[PDB]
C-alpha cells in the first residue's frame, strides 16, 4: 500500500500545532481522504502486533446490536468476566460517571445499527445492496443527535456509504476526530472486514475503501516512533480469509446471513503470510 | 479557482460508465473531495447568470426551521404566492405523491436542523463554537434515519463538521450524489454562504470550505456544452458582502442572532465585480 506513509507527513507542513479539547499540543489538519483496493490485498498496515482479535470482536459486537461490555467479552474471550477489552477502561470511568452499571455504555454504535429510532439499519441496508444495487441512498447514520446525551463516547466514525461498481462493493466512511498514530490503523482494518462480511452477503467482490477525515490529528508526545513507520516499501501483503460460515452462506435471507455472521468468535478470521514486523509499546485512551 | 476544472476530467477516466436507478447513463466516480480557501475569494463558480438569489432563499429558509414550501415563497418573493422557486416541482409530484397539500415537503432539511428529535441543532451548534471553539463534536447531521419515510427527498447534503483554525472557521459537508454539470454549483455556494454567516456570528474568520463526495456523477446528456468549462483561467473573483445586520449583531445571543438573520431577505447578499459570463439553458430534476 502507498498513501498512508504520505499523509502523516503531510500532517506536518499542515501548520495547525495547536491548542484543544484537553489540552496539551497536537499538530492536525482537518480534512483529509484516501483510497484503498481490497483487490490488491488487505490494506491493514501492521507495525505493533496490532491487537487485530480485539478490532475482529468490536465489529461483531457492534453488529450484534450490544452495547452491554461483558457480551463483546464473551466474543472475543468466549468469557462474560475474565479478560480485558477495548472499552473497559472506557466503561469504568465516562460510562459508570453517567450511572450505569456492570454491563452498560449507553446507546453507542451497534445499537445506532440495529436501531436507530426502531430502523434496523444493518438488515436493511444489506437489501439495498441486495435488491436496488445501484441505488445511492445506502447509508448507516451511527450519530444520533437526541441519544448522544446518553453515549460513554460519541461515535468518532459515525457516518458510511456503500456503493456498487459492476460487481464490487465500496465502503467510505467519515470519521470526525482521528489519531492517527495510534487510532487509524484499528480503523483501516474495522471497516475493511466489513466490506469483507458484506461482499460475501452481496456476493460481490469487496471493492475500494475510501476514507473522509475530519480532525487528523497526531498528539505532540515525542514523535519518534512515529516517525519511523516513514520510508519503507511494502512488499508481501495480507490475504484476508474468513472461515466457519455454511456453504449455503450467500443464497441465505439477510436476516438469516448475519443470525450466522454473529456465531463466529475472532478465531474464524485469519491474514496469510503477513508481513511482520515487532510490537513495541506506548498508547493512550481514546 | 482551480481544482473544479481538474475534478470533472478526472470523473472521465473513472472507468464507470454505468447503469444506475432511473437508468440510462451516466460517467461517475465514487469518492470526491476538494478544499477551497475563502480568504482568497468567494469560490462560487459562475457561468449560467446562476440563480443564486433562490440559493440564498432556500439556504435562509433551510435555517428557519420550515418545510413549508410557500415559506420559501415569501422570502425569495415577498409573496406566499407568486413565483416559482426550486422545491416546487418536487412537492408537485413527490411530496404530493405522499398524501401533503399545499405546502408540506415532510420532515425536510430545515426541521432536522432545527428539530432533529427535539435537538435544535443551528442553536446549539453556534455555541458550541462560541464556547468550547476547539471542540471535535460539532456537527449537525441531517440524515434522520427513522424520518426518511416522511420527506418528499431525501437529503442529499447530509452531514457537516466545523473546525476552528487560530481565528478562522472551516466548514465541510458530505453529499451523497451530486450533479456536477448542474448541483455541486448551487452547494458550494449555500455552504460558502453558511461558514460566513457563522463566522459573523462567532466573529471568526471565514476560513477553508472541504467538500466530500459520495456518487458523484454527470448525467449522459451531450456533454458538450458541460466540457466547455474546461481550460480557463479565474482571475477577478467576487467579493462577499452581507447587509442589513445590525451593528450590535456580534455580541447578541446565538438564539437572538439568528432572529435577525432570517429577517433578511435574498436582497441582502451580494457580490463586487463578480466574473461575468453568459447564461446558456438546459436542466433536469433532482
Known amino acids: 500500500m502507498k498513501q498512508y506513509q504520505d499523509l502523516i507527513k503531510d500532517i506536518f507542513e499542515n501548520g495547525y ?13 482537518f480534512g483529509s481522504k484516501l483510497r484503498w483496493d481490497l ?9 505493533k502486533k496490532l491487537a487485530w482479535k ?3 470482536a468490536e465489529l461483531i459486537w457492534f453488529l450484534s446490536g450490544s452495547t452491554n461490555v461483558n457480551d463483546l467479552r464473551l466474543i472475543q474471550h468466549d468469557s462474560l468476566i475474565q479478560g480485558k477489552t477495548v472499552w473497559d477502561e472506557n466503561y469504568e470511568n465516562q460510562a459508570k460517571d453517567l450511572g450505569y452499571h456492570s454491563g452498560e455504555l449507553g446507546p453507542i454504535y451497534g445499537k445506532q445499527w440495529r436501531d436507530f429510532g426502531g430502523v434496523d439499519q444493518i438488515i436493511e441496508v444489506i437489501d439495498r445492496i441486495k435488491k436496488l444495487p445501484n441505488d445511492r441512498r445506502q447509508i448507516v447514520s451511527a450519530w444520533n443527535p437526541a441519544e448522544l446525551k446518553y453515549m460513554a463516547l460519541p461515535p468518532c466514525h ?7 461498481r459492476n460487481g464490487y462493493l465500496d465502503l467510505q466512511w467519515y470519521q470526525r476526530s482521528v489519531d492517527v498514530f495510534l487510532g487509524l490503523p484499528f480503523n483501516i482494518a474495522s471497516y475493511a472486514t466489513l466490506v469483507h462480511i458484506v461482499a460475501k452477503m452481496c456476493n460481490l467482490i469487496p471493492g475500494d475503501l475510501i476514507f473522509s477525515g475530519g480532525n487528523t490529528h497526531i498528539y505532540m508526545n515525542h514523535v519518534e516512533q512515529c516517525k519511523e513507520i516513514l520510508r519503507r516499501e511494502p512488499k508481501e501483503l495480507c490475504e484476508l480469509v474468513i472461515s466457519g ?3 449455503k452462506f450467500r443464497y441465505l435471507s439477510t436476516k438469516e446471513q448475519l443470525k450466522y ?10 491474514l496469510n503470510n503477513y508481513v511482520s514486523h515487532p510490537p513495541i509499546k506506548g498508547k493512550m485512551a481514546v
Chains 1, 2 share one sequence.
Open 261 to 270: 455472521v454473529l456465531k463466529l468468535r475472532p478465531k474464524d478470521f485469519v
Open 39 to 47: 483487490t490488491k490485498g488487505f490494506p491493514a498496515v501492521t507495525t
Open 158 to 164: 459515525m457516518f458510511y456509504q456503500f456503493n456498487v
Open 54 to 56: 480485539a478490532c475482529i
Open 245 to 247: 460460515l455454511p456453504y
Open 17 to 29: 500545532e495547536t491548542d484543544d479539547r484537553t489540552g496539551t499540543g497536537t499538530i492536525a489538519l
